[PDB]
């Protein structure tokens with residue numbers, strides 16, 4: 001098993017994955033903050049304070065009450081300053097012709113500011129083809145959703161195998177997965193795992209939690225995605241540091 | 257098999273489905289226009305001119321370059337005038353806690369203006385639970401995506417059966433399906449079918465077309481969803497009338 005720094009140099013590595021893996025090793029962080037807030041001021045204050053602790057900030061641009069492209073300009077300034085990637089968790093899931101417009105256009109112009117986006121594989125490979133026609137020219141990457149954290153997920157068995165095949169056949173654009181575990185044996189592919197908290201539990205709407213030690217150490221994922229475990233805490237900086245140290249040590253102990 | 261007008265009166269009918277079925281029978285239309293345009297002025301001129309020919313106008317609010325809630329105010333005025341429902345084709349596909357915010361909030365406030373939305377079933381029933389916590393109080397309905405028109409779709413076999421079970425277990429909010437065919441034997445549930453053109457063919461990004469006669473007459477669906485077959489035509493009104501007459505006759509001939 002290679003370190004993040006060595007994976008950053010693999011011959012078939014995507015440039016976006018390489019940039020991410022380099023800053024993960026430099027900063028000793030494999031934490032992605034899920035910045036699940038409705039106010040731009042809160043998003044930007046979290047990005048500034050937690051920027052040093054995170055490899056990635058995950059957005060849902062469509063829950064932000066005061067979205068403007070200028071808010072995203074301020075977010076890019078913080079991403080550059082503190083060295084993290086921006087991941088818009090848009091979960092594209094339409095025919096190729098539709099997702100290309102959803103990615104490039106409308107009010108959000110997601111491709112103009114998002115290093116990474118993600119897509120469901122259920123529509124077939126046209127979803128990836130459509131996104132890549134915008135994303136390849138704009139030097140972006142994509143994650144495919146191979147497994148989900150929620151109760152009753154149908155992303156199991158043959159579905160997960162289809163997501164891995166799709167990623168591997170579109171390596172020019174697909175840089176990894178949203179998954180609960182290592183699903184690809186190819187080290188060029190990132191595994192990002194949501195549904196993470198230090199304590200056992202869930203929410204009232206089908207979210208299920210596992211610990212950083214379980215998903216990084218035992219299940220072999222690379223990055224934890226954490227929302228409420230940080231966002232709902234009083235001291236979001238110390239919460240981020242707890243998650244960072246947990247995920248980083250779990251990674252180091254798997255490397256041996 | 258019951259007429260649309262008789263289905264509108266079924267004991268377990270959802271009020272949104274009832275309203276739709278009534279106006280389909282009154283206007284002799286089972287055509288949903290996929291208003292896949294980037295300009296508000298074009299969206300509104302299509303809605304006004306084609307309103308009499310359609311039972312439903314399907315939006316992708318996130319490809320509209322000049323979206324404002326006022327544009328949607330003007331669309332509701334046309335929907336009320338000409339009697340059609342508004343369907344935002346958002347394809348919610350996240351955990352329940354996230355989709356409730358995506359549905360109610362952000363810039364789009366989808367639940368404030370959309371009669372219908374749709375959701376993927378891959379995350380499990382939490383997606384429906386989250387949406388219904390916004391949509392039930394706002395008297396809205398939802399369609400579940402049981403089958404898709406695109407090449408390589410994984411929405412087949414057990415997946416489609418899971419979508420039908422999920423819809424049937426959430427009939428307070430779920431009013432039907434996006435499907436290629438009749439998938440539910442319960443007549444209270446609408447079947448809407450995209451991937452429709454009069455001529456054989458497809459697009460370059462995995463879209464596949466079938467005719468109105470095939471999907472309404474042979475496959476037993478209720479409503480055709482048509483985008484480019486109308487939108488790319490020179491005379492969009494005459495194109496809409498051709499699709500309307502095709503879908504309506506296919507429906508009548510299945511009734512006998």
Ligand SMILES: O=C(O)c1cc(=O)[nH]c(=O)n1[C@@H]1O[C@H](COP(=O)(O)O)[C@@H](O)[C@H]1O
Pocket residue numbers: 034036058060089118147148149150178194195196207225226227228229350351354
């Ligand atoms: O794509 C995602 O990040 C995602 C996939 C998934 O399977 N589960 C999942 O929870 N998510 C997202 O990750 C975040 C989880 O947030 P918390 O449950 O608050 O930690 C939310 O923003 C979800 O939308």
Ligand SMILES: O=C(O)c1cc(=O)[nH]c(=O)n1[C@@H]1O[C@H](COP(=O)(O)O)[C@@H](O)[C@H]1O
Pocket residue numbers: 094095098290292314316345374403404405406434450451452463481482483484485
């Ligand atoms: O939910 C949808 O309407 C949808 C589901 C599906 O399986 N296939 C599909 O084409 N659609 C949508 O229906 C429309 C099809 O447009 P045309 O291919 O131009 O007729 C697009 O807006 C798609 O996003």
